[PDB]
Structure formats: C-alpha cells, structure tokens
C-alpha cells in the first residue's frame with residue numbers, strides 16, 4: 281500500500297512543504313486522505329444556431345447549452361462462488377481474444393503522431409511541444425526504469441468526472457496497453473460481442489443480425505455508475521492480459537496494473553481552494569481509451585456469467601462445487617463463442633439476446649459482482665425488448681428503411697432535439713469564425729451521412745454546407761468518422777451505404793440525393809421532427825436568406841448552393 285503510493289505522496293509534499301496541512305474536516309470516507317496545499321464551459325456555435333432558428337424556442341435544445349458524490353461509494357467483495365466464476369471466465373476470455381492477436385508495446389513514434397494529429401490523452405505549453413522535447417523523454421525513461429524496479433514517482437491522477445495525467449504517464453499506459461485499441465482486440469471479427477471501429481452505420485445491421493438468432497427478448501440494462509462499480513476483483517481479472525505477454529512488455533504492463541490501476545493517487549481541488557491528495561485501490565482510473573477496452577472486457581465477462589446463471593450452469597454464487605467449475609469450463613468451451621455472438625457490447629453499454637427469458641430474473645451474480653442495474657429495483661426482473669428497432673444502444677435506436685429500388689438501409693436515429701442541441705455547442709476558447717464554421721460543417725456532413733433520413737437534418741446540413749466556403753476543411757479539436765473529409769458527400773454516401781456495406785448485395789451506385797429515402801412523415805415527427813409547424817415552414821421557404829446572412833458574416837469566399845440537391849428547391 282503506502283510503500284507503493286508513498287514516493288508519489290512524499291514527492292508532492294516536498295513541492296508544497298510551505299503550504300502542507302493534514303485537515304481533520306476532510307469529506308472522504310471511502311477515499312484515503314493524506315494532506316493538502318494552496319491553489320485556486322460550453323460555448324454556442326453561431327454558424328449552426330443561425331441556420332437552425334426554429335430551435336431557438338425549443339427548451340430541450342436551448343437548455344443543453346447552459347450550466348464528486350458517487351465517486352465516494354464502496355462496493356462489497358463478491359462471494360467466493362462469484363470470484364471463481366469471474367476468474368474462470370476472464371482466463372477463458374483473454375485466451376479467446378488472444379488466439380489471433382499478439383500483444384506488443386506501442387512506440388514513441390506511434391504516440392507522437394497521435395498527439396501531432398490531436399487526440400484525447402489527458403515547461404511545455406501544448407503536449408505537441410513536449411513530444412518534441414528530449415528532456416520530457418529523459419523524464420519518461422526515469423519513470424520507465426522506476427516501473428521496471430516495481431516503483432512509481434510521477435503517475436498521479438487529477439479529478440475534475442475525467443482524471444487527467446501528465447503526458448509521460450499517458451505514454452507509459454499507451455506503451456503497455458495501447459495495443460488493445462491500436463490492434464482492435466474488441467473488433468466484432470475478433471471478440472464476437474465487441475463493436476470497436478464498427479461505425480454508427482453498422483451498429484443497426486449488427487443488432488438486426490443478433491435479432492436473427494433463436495432466443496428470447498433483447499435485454500439492454502444500463503449499469504448505475506459503471507466506473508464506480510469496478511471492484512479490485514475486476515482490476516485483477518483485467519491484469520491477467522499480462523499472462524499473454526513476455527519480456528519488458530509483461531513487466532511494464534504489470535506495473536501499470538499494480539501501481540496506477542490497483543493503487544491510484546489523485547489530487548482533487550476543494551474550494552473549502554486547496555488540492556487534497558487522496559488514494560484508493562478500486563474503481564476505474566485509467567485513460568479514456570484503455571477504460572473503453574477494459575470496460576468492454578469486464579462487461580463481456582459479466583454478461584456471459586448472467587447468461588450462465590439463466591441457463592442454470594451453476595445453482596448458487598455462495599460457493600462453486602468442483603463439478604460446477606468443470607460444468608462452467610465445458611459451457612465456455614462448448615458454447616462460449618456462440619454466447620458472445622448473441623451480444624453487442626460497447627464499454628459499459630450492452631444488448632444481449634439470451635437463449636430464453638430466464639435471463640430476465642438471473643440477477644444474483646450480476647448484483648453480487650456489483651453491476652447493479654440503473655432505474656429498476658435490485659430484485660425486479662429486467663424488461664426485455666421484442667423488436668430490434670426499439671432497443672437502445674450507444675445513445676441510438678435503429679430504423680429499417682426501404683429505398684425506392686427495394687434495397688434495405690438500417691439507419692441510426694435519436695431524438696432530433698439531442699442532435700441539434702449538440703451541434704449548437706463548441707467546447708473551447710480562442711475559436712476564430714473560420715474554425716467555428718468548419719466545426720459546423722463537420723456536424724452538417726455527419727448529418728448527411730448518418731441522419732439523411734430526417735427531413736430537418738438533411739435540409740439544415742445542405743444549408744450549413746451552402747453557408748460555409750466549399751473548400752474549407754471540417755475540424756474537431758478531439759469510431760469511423762467518414763464525414764471528416766472535403767470529398768463530395770454523395771460520393772462518400774455511396775461508398776459507406778452501398779460499396780463497402782456487407783449487408784447490400786446489389787452495388788448499383790446512387791446517382792442523386794432524391795434516390796435516398798426519408799423515414800415516414802409520422803415516424804419523423806415521433807423522433808422529434810418540426811414538419812407540420814409554421815416555424816419550420818417559414819425556415820425551409822426562406823432558407824436562402826439564412827444562408828446569405830452567414831455568407832455575409834464570413835465574407836467574400838467561394839460558396840456552393842447545395843439546396844437544389846433536394847426536390848422542392850429545384851427551379
């Protein structure tokens with residue numbers, strides 16, 4: 281414990297020896313308190329807002345732009361029967377994920393490029409500058425050699441609930457564990473339940489394939505605060521990925537797991553403004569990308585065990601008999617792969633089509649692993665879905681949409697207020713008119729690619745692309761983002777929905793936007809369309825005037841009129 285975290289703790293004190301204090305009114309019960317010292321929002325995208333005027337009076341849109349507790353909780357230790365189930369399943373799952381993959385270290389050369397290309401990776405101002413400074417790498421080397429020693433000095437978390445770390449520590453995590461993401465361990469092809477790198481244009485088709493299997497309802501239970509419910513028992517089954525490694529990699533990964541994952545150290549600001557230094561062994565404390573993969577892994581494990589429980593593979597979680605152990609092992613070997621194919625899992629989010637509806641009341645292992653369901657009483661059976669087009673997954677639902685030529689699109693969808701409200705927000709300071717416009721164009725092209733079937737979004741997308749210089753490149757400060765390009769959007773649509781779509785047998789390209797269908801007028805309204813409203817009609821008829829207002833603000837640039845791509849706006 282204190283041997284592992286002390287050096288980190290001791291070092292911080294020294295740098296604040298003048299302002300150190302062991303305050304006795306510290307709000308922590310579950311976290312460990314060590315000492316303190318002295319220290320001390322969303323903007324609106326005007327391009328998108330000026331081109332979505334009817335939404336200026338919709339509170340669901342406008343409120344999205346205005347504006348820890350659950351981190352201080354503790355999950356009890358699972359029973360010995362649960363721990364056995366988890367260890368057997370995790371051992372078998374790492375082996376399956378490893379069959380066609382080789383663990384390997386990621387490199388400085390890999391890390392530098394990602395940073396020189398902008399990406400989330402929690403002396404030098406920007407991190408781009410540090411990656412160019414040898415001094416930094418001298419620091420990294422120092423820490424690396426310390427990790428090989430089984431010790432840690434500078435790998436400390438900063439709460440705000442995302443925990444940032446110094447770039448060097450992010451590198452050491454990426455060096456040891458980046459392979460999980462960089463080499464697509466949680467791809468569908470590889471992991472069977474996973475959907476990493478799939479894209480929102482494929483999730484619908486994947487849920488439809490799971491629906492084709494014989495079984496009961498589709499279950500999509502959320503977990504209440506998943507990250508907070510990760511047990512030390514979970515952080516150790518995740519560690520068993522090191523079993524598949526060798527050489528320096530195994531030691532570096534064992535150190536990431538041992539030191540920065542199974543014994544965290546965090547500096548939290550408390551206005552009461554001091555910087556508390558607290559610690560704890562459990563919960564999820566890693567980079568957002570390694571968090572995704574280890575969330576997917578532990579979720580896959582939990583859902584296979586809930587499936588085992590519904591099939592009566594084991595009678596009770598209190599203790600596993602020797603014959604039960606063998607029975608669990610034989611199940612995994614005989615049907616594990618089939619059972620993984622019955623699930624779509626994205627980090628803490630899942631959809632399971634079990635063998636039958638006994639799964640709905642198989643709750644003892646799930647509750648005892650601490651994966652308590654959100655908004656339903658602990659022992660109340662899960663509500664299942666009878667139609668794959670109603671199932672929630674990754675903040676979306678999916679429609680089946682028949683083109684005028686008979687070909688079948690499976691399209692992603694969500695409440696339109698949520699889509700418009702997110703596009704009206706830009707996170708960052710010092711944004712020029714030009715980069716605000718290019719962010720608006722990134723939303724517009726995403727809408728043309730993913731949400732073309734929504735009347736308001738195809739119209740607003742065409743208006744924004746008409747209002748922003750044709751050659752300005754779409755930007756995003758931080759899945760498959762095919763909308764991030766200056767290529768013609770009809771050409772990308774044909775590539776994503778027809779040519780590269782493995783569920784479309786006939787590869788006949790689409791020649792214009794009017795060949796591409798919409799949802800039913802009533803379905804469109806149900807998912808939040810303003811069609812029918814006087815406000816939306818004035819907006820559509822006078823769109824050229826809104827486009828011209830934004831063109832006048834940006835100035836005398838080369839624009840294209842994309843409005844005649846629609847039927848109505850043709851002369």
Ligand SMILES: CN(C[C@H]1CCOC1)c1ncncc1Cl
Pocket residue numbers: 735801802811812817
């Ligand atoms: C006004 N209507 C039809 C009515 C009847 C049911 O929905 C509203 C439109 N329908 C489709 N696209 C654009 C428009 Cl505005």
Ligand SMILES: [Zn+2]
Pocket residue numbers: 423427431432433434435539
């Ligand atoms: Zn360290």
Ligand SMILES: [Zn+2]
Pocket residue numbers: 677679693694807
């Ligand atoms: Zn919908």
